[PDB]
Scaffold this active site. Structure first.
Site, PDB file in Angstrom:
ATOM      1  N   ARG A 171    -126.731 -16.442 -69.378  1.00 40.76           N
ATOM      2  CA  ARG A 171    -127.233 -15.117 -69.470  1.00 40.76           C
ATOM      3  C   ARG A 171    -127.237 -14.676 -69.948  1.00 40.76           C
ATOM      4  NH1 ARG A 171    -120.111 -14.632 -71.228  1.00 40.76           N
ATOM      5  NH2 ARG A 171    -121.918 -15.761 -73.001  1.00 40.76           N
TER       6      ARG A 171
ATOM      7  N   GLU B 215    -110.348 -11.135 -72.816  1.00 36.87           N
ATOM      8  CA  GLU B 215    -110.931 -12.144 -71.516  1.00 36.87           C
ATOM      9  C   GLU B 215    -110.028 -11.586 -70.313  1.00 36.87           C
ATOM     10  OE1 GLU B 215    -114.469 -14.156 -73.479  1.00 36.87           O
ATOM     11  OE2 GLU B 215    -113.508 -15.021 -71.603  1.00 36.87           O
TER      12      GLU B 215
ATOM     13  N   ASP C 240    -116.719  -7.891 -69.924  1.00 38.99           N
ATOM     14  CA  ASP C 240    -118.230  -7.798 -70.555  1.00 38.99           C
ATOM     15  C   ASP C 240    -118.960  -9.117 -69.916  1.00 38.99           C
ATOM     16  OD1 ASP C 240    -117.453 -11.222 -72.343  1.00 38.99           O
ATOM     17  OD2 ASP C 240    -117.039 -11.121 -70.327  1.00 38.99           O
TER      18      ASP C 240
ATOM     19  N   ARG D 200    -124.178 -10.795 -69.554  1.00 38.48           N
ATOM     20  CA  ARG D 200    -123.627 -10.488 -71.350  1.00 38.48           C
ATOM     21  C   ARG D 200    -123.554  -9.233 -71.598  1.00 38.48           C
ATOM     22  NH1 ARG D 200    -120.398  -9.950 -74.579  1.00 38.48           N
ATOM     23  NH2 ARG D 200    -118.954 -11.731 -74.943  1.00 38.48           N
TER      24      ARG D 200
ATOM     25  N   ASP E 265    -117.647  -7.513 -77.942  1.00 37.86           N
ATOM     26  CA  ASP E 265    -116.042  -8.280 -77.428  1.00 37.86           C
ATOM     27  C   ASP E 265    -114.970  -8.200 -76.901  1.00 37.86           C
ATOM     28  OD1 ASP E 265    -117.342 -11.400 -78.084  1.00 37.86           O
ATOM     29  OD2 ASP E 265    -116.519 -10.396 -80.037  1.00 37.86           O
ATOM     30  N   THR E 266    -114.609  -8.145 -75.716  1.00 34.93           N
ATOM     31  CA  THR E 266    -113.430  -7.898 -74.569  1.00 34.93           C
ATOM     32  C   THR E 266    -112.550  -8.601 -74.850  1.00 34.93           C
ATOM     33  OG1 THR E 266    -114.650  -8.635 -72.986  1.00 34.93           O
ATOM     34  CG2 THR E 266    -115.138  -5.956 -73.488  1.00 34.93           C
TER      35      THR E 266
END
EC number: 3.1.31.1
Length: 136
Positions: A82, A38, A16, A30, A35-36
């Site tokens: 970010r 992590e 992400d 970002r 939502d990946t």
């Protein structure tokens, strides 16, 4: 209306997050709305589909001829500094590509930064119906 802008790949950091050169300055971006799993997660570390999502984003931006960033309508950076954007690799949106493969879920959107939310929700639903990765 949203507009795409050129950027240059510096380094892929996570599924992400990618570091890019944007307007002469290196910045961490970002990926908006996704939502990946992590690998560099604060409280958990490596989650089940994290290395895969991470590899996917890396390959996609690394093999691209042109990388573009598209900011949404709201704020452009998060509290960690970010950049918040939809990233395109040769015209293909990385954010959507991850969701379409079942390597990311659509995140809780915060208006005004939610322009492509429905588009992403459509890819997620298809990824779910196909039982891909996260939905397997």
């Amino acid at each position: 209306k949203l507009h795409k802008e050129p950027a240059t790949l510096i380094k892929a950091i996570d599924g992400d997050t990618v570091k890019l050169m944007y307007k002469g300055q290196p910045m961490t971006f970002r990926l908006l709305l996704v939502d990946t799993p992590e690998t560099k997660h604060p409280k958990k570390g490596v989650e089940k589909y994290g290395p895969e999502a991470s590899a996917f984003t890396k390959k996609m931006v690394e093999n691209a001829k042109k990388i573009e960033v598209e900011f949404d309508k709201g704020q452009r950076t998060d509290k960690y500094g970010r950049g918040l954007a939809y990233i395109y690799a040769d015209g293909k949106m990385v954010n959507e590509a991850l969701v379409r493969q079942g390597l990311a879920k659509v995140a809780a959107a915060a208006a005004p930064n939610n322009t492509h939310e429905q588009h992403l929700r459509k890819s997620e639903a298809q990824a779910k119906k196909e039982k891909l990765n996260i939905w397997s």
